[PDB]
């Protein structure tokens, strides 16, 4: 099995700047007819991989010409003249010269931008969920950068770490930011027992956390 090794694993690039990623195979990809079955694909968040470069150095159907594939033998390179926000995603290389065909582990291209503090919003359990004996408190930390952030929950001033589930989003190509959702799930009985709920967000954009709270039974 031909091993396709990509590098770097990740890469951060400022819009406008060039980008270069590599792919090296454990075996030559040139065939007996002069063709090199090496492709480059890009997978944007939530989409299916899409064509970029094929035959090692040829630009695939409808692909923008900012992309350029090069190399031969076992070393291949993909270069993006100038990066656009919509280029963010994971890049793969594939070889169809040796059975079975194999993919590289991918290279994640991240867009680098100006720092941005998160927009924090806290939401109480809905009336409907309350009638089910369950109680979920949701907190959204939207459009921030860099991607590293921390969320802390507080019930009546005391921190709470049990019953918390988080989810992040990929980088948005519209503004190059990230977003995260935090949910604290309690039983209706325990929720009805406390008064204040706080969602604390700590990001490099500020020395002190962004805090949002609400009192049960208060609009």
């Amino acid at each position: 099995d031909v091993v396709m090794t990509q590098s770097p694993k990740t890469i951060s690039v400022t819009i406008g700047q060039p980008a270069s990623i590599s792919c090296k195979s454990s075996q030559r990809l040139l065939n007996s007819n002069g063709k090199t079955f090496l492709n480059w694909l890009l997978q944007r968040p939530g989409q299916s991989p899409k064509r970029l470069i094929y035959l090692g150095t040829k630009l695939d159907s409808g692909v923008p010409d900012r992309f350029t594939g090069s190399g031969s033998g076992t070393d291949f390179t993909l270069k993006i003249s100038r990066v656009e926000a919509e280029d963010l995603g994971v890049y793969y290389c594939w070889q169809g010269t040796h059975f079975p065909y194999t993919f590289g582990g991918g290279t994640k291209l991240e867009i680098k931008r100006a720092d941005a503090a998160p927009t924090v919003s806290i939401f109480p359990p809905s009336s409907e969920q309350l009638t089910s004996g369950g109680a979920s408190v949701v907190c959204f930390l939207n459009n921030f950068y860099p991607k590293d952030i921390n969320v802390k929950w507080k019930i009546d001033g005391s921190e709470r770490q049990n019953g918390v589930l988080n989810s992040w989003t990929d980088q948005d190509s519209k503004d190059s930011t990230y977003s995260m959702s935090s949910t604290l799930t309690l039983t209706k009985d325990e929720y009805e027992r406390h008064n204040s709920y706080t969602c604390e967000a700590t990001h490099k954009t500020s020395t002190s956390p962004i805090v949002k709270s609400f009192n049960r039974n208060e609009c």
């Binding site: 299916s48 991989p49 695939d60 959702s181 208060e218 609009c219």
Partner: protein, 222 residues
């Protein structure tokens, strides 16, 4: 151009079989291409499964030895994938993709279908409205949400106002716990437009044929 689209059961019992279909439009499957099945695992590793070219010739990855079968139905212009003896390790997103047999160009992929190998039961979701707290409605922008809880399996589709509201929307990946998924989505609009212009969360869970259209009601008088 050539367009591919998968379909097939999204949930399968362990030790049974996975059965997918790929319908091709805008090109005859008996011409030029090689119709592939490729899957992506939760970690994002891609694995080529195999193919059936324009003349019916097939080839599959030795890693699946004996469990895979790739067929076609020219009268319907479709090719199929069959994977038996599945286990949770076969849980992944499946794709069909066409590549020119001559140079491996014109690669076209379907939207991809998720297939879960589990013995868990299909469960419809509860769609809860996330109305902002009074205090956070006095700014120039207001954020609302929707919480889709307790469903299985994936996926669910979620839109706002039947898709007419797409700007300022954040739908997060679902988190699994105890064979049940939970997902949330947020939408931000100019505060002065709410609640004048209503905002409704449209959730669909194909596995259970369930649809919910929850309108977000303001906390306080409605």
């Amino acid at each position: 151009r050539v367009q591919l689209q998968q379909s097939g059961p999204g949930l399968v019992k362990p030790s049974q079989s996975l059965s997918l279909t790929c319908t091709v439009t805008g090109y005859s499957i008996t011409s030029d291409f090689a119709w592939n099945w490729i899957r992506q695992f939760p970690g994002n590793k891609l694995e080529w499964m195999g193919y059936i070219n324009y003349s019916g010739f097939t080839s599959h990855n030795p890693s699946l030895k004996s469990r895979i079968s790739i067929t076609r139905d020219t009268s319907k212009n479709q090719f199929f994938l069959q994977l038996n003896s599945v286990t949770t390790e076969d849980t992944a997103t499946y794709y069909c993709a066409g590549l020119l047999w001559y140079d491996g160009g014109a690669g076209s992929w379907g939207q991809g279908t998720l297939v879960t190998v589990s013995a868990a039961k299909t469960t419809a979701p509860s769609v809860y409205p996330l109305a902002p707290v009074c205090g956070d409605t006095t700014g120039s922008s207001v954020t609302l949400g929707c919480l889709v809880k307790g469903y299985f399996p994936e996926p669910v589709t979620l839109t706002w106002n039947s898709g007419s509201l797409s700007s300022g929307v954040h739908t997060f990946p679902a988190v699994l716990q105890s064979d049940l998924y939970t997902l949330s989505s947020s939408v931000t609009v100019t505060s002065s437009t709410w609640p004048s212009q209503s905002i409704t969360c449209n959730v669909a869970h194909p596995a259970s044929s369930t649809k919910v259209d929850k309108k977000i009601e303001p906390r306080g008088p409605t």
